[PDB]
């Protein structure tokens, strides 16, 4: 599309500038253009892709939650009828959010996942696929909701299976995947016990492997372990 | 307190 | 344009929802649609218009400053040549910022200012006109820079002349106008002494009129006086 | 410390 005439390296350079300027929509457009060049992404480039889209969809999700809360209050007994505007605007934001999720899922399907053979890349992309189906599930209310939830579960499960076989328990991708799959269990799949078990087992297995790490790797892993601990403290 | 995901 | 089929009241309602959701681009588009209905704006509606566009252009200005700093460092002796990307991306953000300024100035010219007869509305719109010319001046480097600066000065000056004749020295619009015109003097017109004199005289005249105010008006006026004081402390 | 304008 619009980035077809820009060099791959220039798109990557501009994505990094956009990150510095907090221009995450631009960042995502640059990284989409880079993916569409058709070459595999390096570790750093995968991170740039993830940062960009997580910030874009994060703003949409936060706005959707604000609007959904207002709409819920409007449907409480004793609330005045204000017309269709709250629903319409929540739907507008929802449709834009779904479009971003579909865009990311489309990049993963055409053709990031099929070309990713190393564990670090394949797990990363499958985690992303689970995440963006999970964001679709956050807003789903209709007849495809069960299939959206199962698509998130299936992507997370394949990422877990690979990560357990091919990565150490302290690997940051393995840890971030487990954190997100645990959130999926807690708040999407109505399985809080599974969420707690996964977070606890992930934390404890990482703790036992910290002794193998350099100081810098220890810092990377313990940062994510603290997020698991934060959730365990909230949930128990 | 909102639960953490990987950000 | 795209908002022509939406009711004026629905645009206003959605602008307020967009503000709550921090969706300032949507907010600005809704308020532009409301202005284009052709009716005058109430005090609250003028504030919504101002909030929306100030947030949009504020994000662009902050991003422009980040990119401009990077570009400046790239042109220092001993810096490696990295190609045209930093300039290109700064120019992209700059062009988008200029477009938003031109959009606001176009609404003011067609036809908000000419229909605004009360001091509170006319001063507000002329202040806005000075502000958006000032934002154009922040990025101007060419042959029209002097005329852009003079357009900001002229709009601010007419707003000041009306505000001094028709508003009390504690009026929040009068105070915010003086704050912004003082910033214009300091950092656009290379007139720091004029900036300091204006801020001091505005502060002192407001102080002398506080005794006339209710508690709520006192809170409104003293909040803006503190911004004048903040600048005086920084500049002296 | 950035100078204040009316925000
Ligand atoms: C996919 C993924 C995993 C891990 C990180 C990471 O190291 N973080 C500190 C973020 C919190 S899990 C980032 C990732 F994108
Ligand atoms: C134009 C204008 C003037 C004053 C205010 C205001 O009351 N503030 C508290 C903002 C800081 S000056 C807002 C305005 F838009
Ligand atoms: Cl809408
Ligand atoms: Cl560009
Ligand atoms: Mg090429
Ligand atoms: Mg491969
Ligand atoms: Mg391995
Ligand atoms: Mg009508
Ligand atoms: Mg009139
Ligand atoms: Mg009067």
């Amino acid at each position: 599309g619009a980035m077809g005439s820009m060099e791959r390296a220039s798109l990557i350079q501009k994505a990094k500038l956009a990150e510095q300027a907090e221009r995450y929509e631009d960042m995502a457009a640059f990284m989409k253009g880079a993916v569409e060049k058709g070459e595999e992404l390096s570790n750093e480039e995968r991170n740039l892709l993830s940062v960009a889209y997580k910030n874009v969809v994060g703003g949409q999700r936060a706005a959707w939650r604000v609007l959904s809360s207002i709409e819920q209050k409007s449907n409480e007994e004793g609330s005045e009828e204000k017309g269709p505007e709250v629903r319409e605007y929540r739907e507008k934001v929802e449709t834009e959010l779904q479009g971003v999720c579909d865009t990311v899922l489309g990049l993963l399907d055409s053709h990031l996942i099929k070309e990713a053979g190393d564990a670090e890349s394949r797990v990363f992309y499958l985690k992303m696929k689970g995440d963006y189906y999970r964001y679709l599930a956050e807003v789903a209310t209709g007849d495809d909701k069960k299939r959206i939830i199962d698509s998130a579960r299936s992507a997370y499960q394949e990422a877990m299976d690979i990560s357990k076989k091919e990565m150490p328990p302290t690997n940051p991708i393995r840890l971030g995947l487990a954190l997100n799959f645990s959130v999926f269990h807690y708040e999407i799949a109505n399985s809080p016990e599974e969420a707690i078990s996964l977070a606890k087992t992930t934390f404890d297995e990482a703790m036992a492997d910290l002794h193998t790490l350099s100081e810098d790797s220890y810092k990377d892993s313990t940062l994510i372990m603290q997020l698991l601990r934060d959730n365990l403290t909230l949930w128990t | 307190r909102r639960r953490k995901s990987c950000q």
Side-chain angles (χ1 to χ4, degrees), chain A residues 40-56:
Chain A
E40 297 187 37
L41 302 190
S42 69
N43 180 68
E44 177 172 10
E45 294 161 354
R46 291 189 298 272
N47 194 68
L48 293 168
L49 178 68
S50 177
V51 164
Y53 278 109
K54 281 295 172 73
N55 274 272
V56 170

Side-chain angles (χ1 to χ4, degrees), chain A residues 4-9 37:
Chain A
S5 62
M6 207 177 307
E7 287 278 17
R8 187 185 189 280
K37 297 304 176 182

Side-chain angles (χ1 to χ4, degrees), chain A residues 3 6-7 9-11 13-14 17-18 20-23 25-27 30 59-60 62-64 66-67 70 83-86 88-89 92-93 96:
Chain A
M3 308 288 185
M6 207 177 307
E7 287 278 17
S10 299
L11 289 163
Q13 183 180 359
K14 292 178 181 180
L17 292 171
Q20 291 186 87
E22 298 185 278
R23 293 275 288 200
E25 188 166 13
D26 286 352
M27 201 194 168
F30 293 138
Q60 295 169 319
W64 184 95
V66 166
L67 301 171
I70 293 169
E85 292 87 353
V86 166
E88 284 171 353
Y89 188 47
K92 183 206 172 93
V93 173
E96 189 190 284

Side-chain angles (χ1 to χ4, degrees), chain A residues 1-72 74-76 78-80 83-142 144-164 166-218 220-236:
Chain A
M3 308 288 185
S5 62
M6 207 177 307
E7 287 278 17
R8 187 185 189 280
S10 299
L11 289 163
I12 298 296
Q13 183 180 359
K14 292 178 181 180
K16 288 172 192 177
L17 292 171
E19 186 181 27
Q20 291 186 87
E22 298 185 278
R23 293 275 288 200
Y24 293 104
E25 188 166 13
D26 286 352
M27 201 194 168
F30 293 138
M31 288 311 299
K32 176 175 187 293
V35 168
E36 291 174 343
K37 297 304 176 182
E39 299 281 2
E40 297 187 37
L41 302 190
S42 69
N43 180 68
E44 177 172 10
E45 294 161 354
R46 291 189 298 272
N47 194 68
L48 293 168
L49 178 68
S50 177
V51 164
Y53 278 109
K54 281 295 172 73
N55 274 272
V56 170
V57 83
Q60 295 169 319
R61 289 165 66 212
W64 184 95
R65 291 189 299 272
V66 166
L67 301 171
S68 187
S69 186
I70 293 169
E71 186 179 16
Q72 287 328 131
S74 83
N75 295 311
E76 293 198 5
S79 305
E80 271 298 319
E85 292 87 353
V86 166
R87 186 193 38 90
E88 284 171 353
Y89 188 47
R90 187 270 299 158
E91 282 170 14
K92 183 206 172 93
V93 173
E94 184 172 303
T95 299
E96 189 190 284
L97 182 165
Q98 292 170 320
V100 172
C101 294
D102 292 342
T103 293
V104 175
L105 292 167
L107 296 171
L108 294 170
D109 204 49
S110 300
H111 300 279
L112 289 168
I113 288 168
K114 67 176 56 69
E115 295 184 358
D118 292 355
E120 298 58 39
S121 56
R122 193 166 185 79
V123 173
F124 192 95
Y125 293 136
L126 288 164
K127 175 184 54 173
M128 285 183 79
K129 182 174 183 176
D131 292 335
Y132 285 88
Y133 276 112
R134 167 164 65 89
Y135 305 152
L136 290 176
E138 289 181 341
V139 304
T141 60
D144 268 353
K145 169 158 217 243
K146 283 174 182 166
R147 279 181 281 271
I148 289 165
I149 291 175
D150 202 73
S151 290
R153 183 206 60 62
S154 180
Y156 286 137
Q157 191 60 62
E158 183 186 347
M160 297 284 295
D161 293 344
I162 300 166
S163 76
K164 288 188 239 240
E166 301 293 343
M167 293 170 153
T170 47
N171 176 276
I173 302 165
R174 182 166 167 179
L175 291 175
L177 165 62
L179 178 71
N180 283 7
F181 193 26
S182 168
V183 170
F184 168 84
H185 288 304
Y186 192 91
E187 69 177 30
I188 308 298
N190 192 29
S191 303
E193 295 184 325
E194 187 71 14
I196 291 162
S197 289
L198 175 58
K200 190 174 199 313
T201 292
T202 302
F203 183 98
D204 290 347
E205 292 149 28
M207 173 72 45
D209 184 53
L210 291 173
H211 77 270
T212 66
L213 301 183
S214 70
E215 172 167 347
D216 285 359
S217 295
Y218 171 98
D220 292 341
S221 297
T222 57
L223 181 73
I224 306 165
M225 293 156 75
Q226 180 65 47
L227 304 173
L228 293 162
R229 171 65 50 209
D230 291 340
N231 285 353
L232 286 166
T233 295
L234 183 65
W235 293 341
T236 67

